[PDB]
Amino acid sequence: ASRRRAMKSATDNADDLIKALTLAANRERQAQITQEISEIVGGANAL
Amino acid sequence: SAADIEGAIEDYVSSFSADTEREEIGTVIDAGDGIAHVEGLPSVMTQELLEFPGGVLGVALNLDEHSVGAVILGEFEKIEEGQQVKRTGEVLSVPVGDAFLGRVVNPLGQPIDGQGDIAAETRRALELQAPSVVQRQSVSEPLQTGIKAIDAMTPIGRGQRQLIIGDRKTGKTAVCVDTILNQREAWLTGDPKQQVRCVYVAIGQKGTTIASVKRALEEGGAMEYTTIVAAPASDAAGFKWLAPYTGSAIGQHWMYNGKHVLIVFDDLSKQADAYRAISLLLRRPPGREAFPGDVFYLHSRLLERCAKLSDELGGGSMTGLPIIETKANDISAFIPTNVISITDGQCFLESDLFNQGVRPAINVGVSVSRVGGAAQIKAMKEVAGSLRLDLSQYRELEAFAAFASDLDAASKAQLDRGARLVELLKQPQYSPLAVEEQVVAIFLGTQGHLDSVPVEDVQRFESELLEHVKASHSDIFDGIRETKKLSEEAEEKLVSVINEFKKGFQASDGSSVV
Amino acid sequence: YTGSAIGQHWMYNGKHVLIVFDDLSKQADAYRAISLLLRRPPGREAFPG
Amino acid sequence: TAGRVVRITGPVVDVEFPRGSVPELFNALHAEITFGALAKTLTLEVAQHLGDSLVRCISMQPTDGLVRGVEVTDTGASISVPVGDGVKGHVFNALGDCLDDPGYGKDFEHWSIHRKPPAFSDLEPRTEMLETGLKVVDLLTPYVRGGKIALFGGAGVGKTVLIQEMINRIARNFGGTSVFAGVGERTREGNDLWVELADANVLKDTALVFGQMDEPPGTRMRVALSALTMAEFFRDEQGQDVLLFIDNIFRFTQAGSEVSTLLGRMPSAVGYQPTLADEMGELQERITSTRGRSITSMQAVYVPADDYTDPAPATTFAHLDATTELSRAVFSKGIFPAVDPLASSSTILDPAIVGDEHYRVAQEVIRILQRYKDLQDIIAILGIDELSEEDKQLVNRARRIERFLSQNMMAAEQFTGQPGSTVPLKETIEAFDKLTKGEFDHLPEQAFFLIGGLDDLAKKAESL
Amino acid sequence: TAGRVVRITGPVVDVEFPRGSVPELFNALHAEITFGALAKTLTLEVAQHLGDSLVRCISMQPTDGLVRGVEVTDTGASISVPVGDGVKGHVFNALGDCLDDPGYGKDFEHWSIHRKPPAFSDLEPRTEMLETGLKVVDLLTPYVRGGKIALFGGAGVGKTVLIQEMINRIARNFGGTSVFAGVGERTREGNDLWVELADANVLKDTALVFGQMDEPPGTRMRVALSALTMAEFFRDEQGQDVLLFIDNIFRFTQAGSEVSTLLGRMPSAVGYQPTLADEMGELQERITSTRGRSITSMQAVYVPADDYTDPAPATTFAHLDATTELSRAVFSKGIFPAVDPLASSSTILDPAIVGDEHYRVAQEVIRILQRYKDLQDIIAILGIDELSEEDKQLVNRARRIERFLSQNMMAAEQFTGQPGSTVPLKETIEAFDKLTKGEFDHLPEQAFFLIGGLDDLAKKAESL
Ligand SMILES: Nc1ncnc2c1ncn2[C@@H]1O[C@H](COP(=O)(O)OP(=O)(O)OP(=O)(O)O)[C@@H](O)[C@H]1O
Ligand SMILES: Nc1ncnc2c1ncn2[C@@H]1O[C@H](COP(=O)(O)OP(=O)(O)OP(=O)(O)O)[C@@H](O)[C@H]1O
Ligand SMILES: [Mg+2]
Ligand SMILES: [Mg+2]
Numbered sequence A: 001a002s003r004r005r006a007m008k009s010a011t012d013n014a015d016d017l018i019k020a021l022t023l024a025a026n027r028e029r030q031a032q033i034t035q036e037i038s039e040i041v042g043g044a045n046a047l
Numbered sequence B: 001s002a003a004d005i006e007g008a009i010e011d012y013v014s015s016f017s018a019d020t021e022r023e024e025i026g027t028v029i030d031a032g033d034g035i036a037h038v039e040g041l042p043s044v045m046t047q048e049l050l051e052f053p054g055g056v057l058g059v060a061l062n063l064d065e066h067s068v069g070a071v072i073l074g075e076f077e078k079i080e081e082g083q084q085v086k087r088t089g090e091v092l093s094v095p096v097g098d099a100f101l102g103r104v105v106n107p108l109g110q111p112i113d114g115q116g117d118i119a120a121e122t123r124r125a126l127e128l129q130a131p132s133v134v135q136r137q138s139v140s141e142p143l144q145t146g147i148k149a150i151d152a153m154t155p156i157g158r159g160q161r162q163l164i165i166g167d168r169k170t171g172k173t174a175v176c177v178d179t180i181l182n183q184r185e186a187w188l189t190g191d192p193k194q195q196v197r198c199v200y201v202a203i204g205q206k207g208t209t210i211a212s213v214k215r216a217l218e219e220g221g222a223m224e225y226t227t228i229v230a231a232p233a234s235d236a237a238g239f240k241w242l243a244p245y246t247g248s249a250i251g252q253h254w255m256y257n258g259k260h261v262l263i264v265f266d267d268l269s270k271q272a273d274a275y276r277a278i279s280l281l282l283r284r285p286p287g288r289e290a291f292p293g294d295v296f297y298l299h300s301r302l303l304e305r306c307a308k309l310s311d312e313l314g315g316g317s318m319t320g321l322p323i324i325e326t327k328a329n330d331i332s333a334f335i336p337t338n339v340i341s342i343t344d345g346q347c348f349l350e351s352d353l354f355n356q357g358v359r360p361a362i363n364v365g366v367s368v369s370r371v372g373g374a375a376q377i378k379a380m381k382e383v384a385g386s387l388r389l390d391l392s393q394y395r396e397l398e399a400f401a402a403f404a405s406d407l408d409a410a411s412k413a414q415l416d417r418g419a420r421l422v423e424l425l426k427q428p429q430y431s432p433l434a435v436e437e438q439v440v441a442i443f444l445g446t447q448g449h450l451d452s453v454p455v456e457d458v459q460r461f462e463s464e465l466l467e468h469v470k471a472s473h474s475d476i477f478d479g480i481r482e483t484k485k486l487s488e489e490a491e492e493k494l495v496s497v498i499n500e501f502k503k504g505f506q507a508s509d510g511s512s513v514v
Numbered sequence C: 001y002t003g004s005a006i007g008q009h010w011m012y013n014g015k016h017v018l019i020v021f022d023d024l025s026k027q028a029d030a031y032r033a034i035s036l037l038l039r040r041p042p043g044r045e046a047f048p049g
Numbered sequence D, E: 001t002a003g004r005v006v007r008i009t010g011p012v013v014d015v016e017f018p019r020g021s022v023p024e025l026f027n028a029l030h031a032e033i034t035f036g037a038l039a040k041t042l043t044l045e046v047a048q049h050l051g052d053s054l055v056r057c058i059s060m061q062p063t064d065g066l067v068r069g070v071e072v073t074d075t076g077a078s079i080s081v082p083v084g085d086g087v088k089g090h091v092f093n094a095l096g097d098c099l100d101d102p103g104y105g106k107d108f109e110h111w112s113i114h115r116k117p118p119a120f121s122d123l124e125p126r127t128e129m130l131e132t133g134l135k136v137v138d139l140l141t142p143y144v145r146g147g148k149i150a151l152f153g154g155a156g157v158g159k160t161v162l163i164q165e166m167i168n169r170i171a172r173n174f175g176g177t178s179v180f181a182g183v184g185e186r187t188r189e190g191n192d193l194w195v196e197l198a199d200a201n202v203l204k205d206t207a208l209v210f211g212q213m214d215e216p217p218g219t220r221m222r223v224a225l226s227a228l229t230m231a232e233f234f235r236d237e238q239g240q241d242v243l244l245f246i247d248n249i250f251r252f253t254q255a256g257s258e259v260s261t262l263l264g265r266m267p268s269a270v271g272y273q274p275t276l277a278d279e280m281g282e283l284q285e286r287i288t289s290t291r292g293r294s295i296t297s298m299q300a301v302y303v304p305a306d307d308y309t310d311p312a313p314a315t316t317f318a319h320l321d322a323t324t325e326l327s328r329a330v331f332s333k334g335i336f337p338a339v340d341p342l343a344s345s346s347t348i349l350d351p352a353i354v355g356d357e358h359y360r361v362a363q364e365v366i367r368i369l370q371r372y373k374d375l376q377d378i379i380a381i382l383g384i385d386e387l388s389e390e391d392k393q394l395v396n397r398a399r400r401i402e403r404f405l406s407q408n409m410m411a412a413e414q415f416t417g418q419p420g421s422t423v424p425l426k427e428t429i430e431a432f433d434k435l436t437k438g439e440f441d442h443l444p445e446q447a448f449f450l451i452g453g454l455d456d457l458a459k460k461a462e463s464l
Helices: A002-045 B002-015 B148-152 B172-181 B207-219 B237-255 B268-281 B295-303 B334-342 B351-356 B378-384 B387-401 B409-425 B435-446 B455-470 B475-483 B488-504 C002-012 C024-037 D135-140 D159-172 D187-200 D217-236 D249-263 D276-284 D311-316 D328-332 D356-382 D389-404 D410-416 D425-436 D454-461 E135-140 E159-169 E187-199 E217-238 E250-263 E276-287 E311-319 E328-332 E356-381 E389-404 E410-416 E425-437 E454-463
Strands: B025-032 B035-039 B049-051 B057-063 B067-073 B084-086 B093-096 B122-125 B163-166 B196-203 B226-231 B260-266 B317-324 B345-349 D003-009 D012-016 D027-033 D040-051 D054-059 D071-078 D080-083 D109-112 D148-152 D177-185 D206-212 D242-247 D293-300 D322-325 E004-009 E012-016 E028-033 E040-051 E054-059 E080-083 E091-093 E109-112 E148-153 E177-183 E206-211 E242-247 E295-302 E322-325
Touching (some): B122 B237, B163 B172, B226 B237, B237 B317, B237 D276, B295 B334, B378 B435, B409 B435, B455 B475, D003 D071, D012 D040, D027 D054, D071 D080, D071 D109, D135 D425, D159 D187, D159 D242, D177 D187, D187 D206, D242 D249, D356 D389, D389 D425, E012 E028, E012 E250, E040 E250, E135 E322, E135 E356, E148 E159, E159 E410, E187 E206, E217 E250, E217 E276, E217 E295, E250 E276, E250 E311, E356 E389, E389 E425
Parallel strands (some): B196 B226, B260 B317, D148 D293, D177 D242, E177 E206
Antiparallel strands (some): B025 D040, B093 B122, D027 D071, D040 D054, E012 E054
């Protein structure tokens, strides 16, 4: 019974950690796209 | 009746002046994506309202040697090359005055509600300096938001900047509209020192949302004192950018005249997006999250005019309630952290709690009122001073309880107290409570009188008990109202009535709560 | 496009064609190079719009 | 008075005009390509004024073969789409030229695709349910009349069947019309949709507008507006409730991004156009109810990288009022309209707008189905017998609740022959109140399949 | 003779002078704004020469209503700020204009705010400890008297509360003078600090200079130097020991970035100005003490978007003897002052400077907390129960240490009511030695929050 409870808690914590890591990964992906575009367009603006 | 009709037009005709003066007319040499370059206008002022022939207006940002770069406000699709551009002799400014009360006006003061023109007292420049350090005094009087959560845990004081912040569909406009509606009891007093005027600046909100907010205000009598500055999502970037500034101008005119204003900005994140559009279309290099480096300047310039002036400047105030639409509870993002750095406290409305059924979804622990406590009636402070930490501790402990087989008696007691307090704070929409009612309701739970009530019935026990008091021992409410302190005599009366009721209260299981 | 043309001639004449491209990422990179050498404005990952 | 093409850079074309004849923004200009293989009449949409009487334009057709100095004739009006009763039953492109019968609609009334949303005073201040007559939608995902409904989907989950069903219901219940805007629509799927609607006999109540993916970004960006112009004519002139499908709105956003890149605007956010929210407002805010007639809309929204924080969905979802998600899990179990009761949602589903009873029954249905989903893992791993008596009871009730959310959709008439069902809203509320209380738990599961309402449930059960 | 405004780009004004009268870099220029609603004498600071006798200037007051072609008169000297014993007890703006009474300080000695940092020969590293009375600072990040101190934080972590806490700890009993520089922080905070110092009778010994957020980037970047000039006058001309609080120094770099994007300088890594390192250095290097004359400095640093790798904090780290990195994670635990014990560091945490026992206890505490951080993954998924027993005991006393580092700061009274407590260094060392050795592994965790001391720890443990 304690194993059932502990692993239910572990699955919930793993799901929450997956959600948080997916949010962080999406934000880092967006940041990488934005930074790359900034570098490209800054190069363009200097011709 | 016909006499006034004839007389108004007669006055207009006779007052007509053959004003032959000198207009500097320039010519547009370029226009595209909301930006128009106007050559000529050799004496233009920076941030002047240029008037293009289609009736549209523009703000002259860049004054180069060749031409003037103007951010166009409104329907830029009408602009074309070769059009004459006339000065207007006014730096970026909007009309202000009492006539704006009850009017929906686009970010330039032009009414869109369909009623007649607005009798503006004067014009105010959107970019006047905020009050200096020596022209303020710490906010010393409350702005009862009508929400038990806000007015108990994170109070808003007149002159404070309270940042409502949370994901989409999480109860932000609801909180702002509730705090606008709740001020009717103060408005009816007719006392400028106590009346709270309102200004609701909708940035990028849907047209239907602004219509619904206007209907909600009308149904609650709030349009006698509430202005709406509507920059719907349909409008160009310029209107969305300068809508909060025109709302702040309308509010500031009253703030400097000794009156109290409540400015809501819904959402300042949509202002930041519109300013990103304007700046990038001007080819200004982006910064973090593609925003320009001075987005913080935008929002701070805006919210730093929300202040509680000193008695030497009329003792007026302007309370700001900016709404920030976070993305998936990213309170650490750029714009949220900015507006937190500018504002004096945040009410974080978590979406997990909003879906869970806890409305308003105030996230305790992360929510705080920096200059709160001082602006909070003594009764509310004595009864709810410890509520925020207790609720945050209950939230921390709930995770442990969700998986623990059993807990310490003290931990069980704290879990119960939190599970009753969170239900007590929960509140239906458009149902603001006077401060007396809030203090009594919070007293029920903080002093433990709810500990005998089952959780699911707390909402009813409180909801009906306030009714029982409302017309059985009104001495309690009147005592709170007049004294603003929960005097021990009134406290004894209140506990007596609570027990008298609890004897006659029946829970959902049929058990007595004695 | 040369492959698509050779295929389309058979396609419009009533035959059935099967066109493989190993790999379209290398066409995209080639077009990106041509566009950037022509000063065409770049968007995401430097690609032309 | 006619200009000259001075620069050709792919889709972007720059046109010089005499001193006092420069076309206004968003005017449509006509150019000619005279090469034998690629002869065309290009439509150029003026995007910017560059000065010196030069206008930068985004060609709505491929510019391959265009020659510098070729004459450009100004129409003086924006891209004009045909509007009328004649656009019902035909397929159009973003420029208004018919595709199944070329030259058709040239004598119809023409409307500019750029026109303002309803003035503020004419917006309806109260959101009203659109009683679709589908149990699942009217119960758990109530559509807002004059609102936008996210329509997630995929292969075989019956998205096209739901589209046909909604065309049928809006054309037989509300006496309205439907318009389908294929913003970036696969030519194959466009043809499939056209033939399916022609076979379902609902094409006569639908106007199809396709901005095909092979077309440059200009048409993919303007097809949504063209279809919405047709819908706005059906609303503000013929007094018909209209239903505008948009597959896919993310491709409207992408087309805007591509045009922005072409014109030289610095990309923003995650590479999207700086004017992203402005364009999304110009599109969506025209989809609203005014003067008692409404353009409801169902929009398929592709979330990039499965990220709802991406600017495209995060700007679309500010305007979407309801979400309908079709899943393989529900579909494979024979439950059509395939709507996932748990993933889907609606903004109007609050006791303030819907009745308190409706909210209570909907929440109870969601609760039962959520518990059944929680238990499904145990069911699949350990067998159904592992459940307790309460859990077994709840599982049995949830099976029949989820099978009852199915409905003999009107669009299925062409297959089964049996006429579709339009359950009254209160009738559905009472049916699901009874079914969540177990009153029909003794009936066999197969009884609830594809049954339109409460009385039909009994009249089908008697057959078992 | 006088120049002429030739172009205006927000707070940046280009002025064209006669061939022979170009002003030097950092020379103060005076323009005029005549539009009545906001007419003012506009101060500009020459920042570049562009050729053709043009000079590009930053604007101290907002350039609203400024007109092309207005006269600009160079003052022949850089922006000057008043100095003297008089500046103690008054509030000044970035340009030296007094605020509490406008006519003040116009007859005092005026110093140019632009001056080279002290020559290297006069520098020597200060190493004397500055007992603040806080457990975390006095144990793990011992502040350096006469040295630079920082308080890094995102938004809402406790930078300003701790700044005013140290105003209470240090300034309230300081023998010398103090200066407070509001660099782009709230005007409300400025007024609150002014009244608090007036009530605490510390104002008579403080010179306040404010450049708060509602001011353009010009003053928002020169206010730090304006305050630092009074600080250096006290350091050099008077020989007094000085405190220099600066809240918030990141606003200096942000105003730098704004003026950079306006002046035309290309963007750096994440949009900041290319001279971020140089602009920060020419300011920080002046805040150093010299041989016989001490200038303690305490700077709040805003770490934007909680990203500690941003170039501004990443540059200002190298300029600090003691760094106190406030973190969101510690803040959400309620552990005020919210100091991340690991990220923070001090250069005097060397067993030769603080002593053997102090360093030993600090290093053991850091080891315990580092192992806790290394176990955080398992703690998050599985829980403390699945660790090894040594790790379990370490995690228990790590939680106890981490809570014990919290303290009921004096400045926290206004937010909590509970009065503030100061724990002398010896008691902190002894208490943390006891915690690390395990002498208090039996008391509950809750007994260590916001307690501040061994006696208070015992009292609170008995209370629970
Ligand atoms: N306190 C409340 N109790 C119950 N329902 C509420 C409450 N506040 C808001 N709602 C409901 O929540 C839904 C969304 O509310 P609201 O518009 O205030 O949210 P929001 O987060 O401000 O939205 P948006 O980002 O779209 O402006 C509406 O159904 C509203 O009725
Ligand atoms: N020790 C403490 N005890 C209680 N509450 C605290 C404490 N420290 C901080 N807080 C709460 O956190 C808020 C943070 O205040 P503070 O001004 O330090 O924040 P900041 O975001 O770092 O500042 P700034 O706006 O200067 O960047 C305080 O107003 C108070 O609400
Ligand atoms: Mg809202
Ligand atoms: Mg601060």
